[PDB]
């Protein structure tokens, strides 16, 4: 089943709050990536991190990916409603 | 909005019957292909091709996509429920 979910976004090193961003589970990466940029500043250049103790870059195709590479969505990662994630750029 | 939609698959030049597959509007080409694959056969190496006189290859990103460019999912190209796909490989 496909459902919608909120991640908590933090720009790393700015110093400001955390800003929402509703997404979908069956959102690959990349998708979760353009959602985000469309709410911050209302892919390829930016860095999308999540700490589940060891902090972990989400990328459609990673090493993780399901194995040919399936490409990798939040439900892939095992990201769930409310979850916060780090986004950096260069 | 996102929704279910099938499409229907002919394998390019096997003579065989098209296949019909379930995907969602939201599905990126990749994850179209996925779902193509595992269902006819229960990526870079499979094209998939669409008819809407003109046709057209889907691919993630191409010189169509939302212009920094933007995924394409079946919303993007505009394909809808019932719709033929051609599925050919190398
Ligand atoms: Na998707």
């Not at 909120?6 to 589970?25: F, H, M, R, W, Y």
């Given at each position: 089943?496909?459902?919608?979910?909120?991640?908590?976004?933090?720009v790393?090193?700015?110093?400001?709050?955390?800003?929402?961003?509703?997404?979908?589970?069956?959102?690959?990466?990349?998708?979760?990536?353009?959602?985000?940029?469309?709410?911050?500043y209302?892919?390829?250049?930016?860095?999308?991190?999540?700490?589940?103790?060891?902090?972990?870059?989400?990328?459609?195709?990673?090493?993780?990916?399901?194995?040919?590479?399936?490409?990798?969505?939040?439900?892939?990662?095992?990201?769930?409603?409310?979850?916060?994630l780090?986004?950096?750029?260069?």
């Amino acid at each position: 089943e496909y459902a919608p979910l909120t991640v908590s976004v933090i720009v790393q090193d700015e110093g400001v709050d955390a800003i929402p961003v509703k997404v979908l589970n069956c959102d690959t990466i990349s998708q979760v990536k353009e959602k985000i940029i469309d709410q911050v500043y209302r892919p390829d250049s930016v860095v999308l991190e999540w700490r589940p103790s060891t902090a972990q870059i989400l990328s459609d195709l990673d090493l993780t990916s399901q194995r040919w590479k399936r490409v990798n969505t939040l439900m892939h990662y095992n990201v769930r409603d409310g979850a916060t994630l780090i986004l950096s750029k260069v």
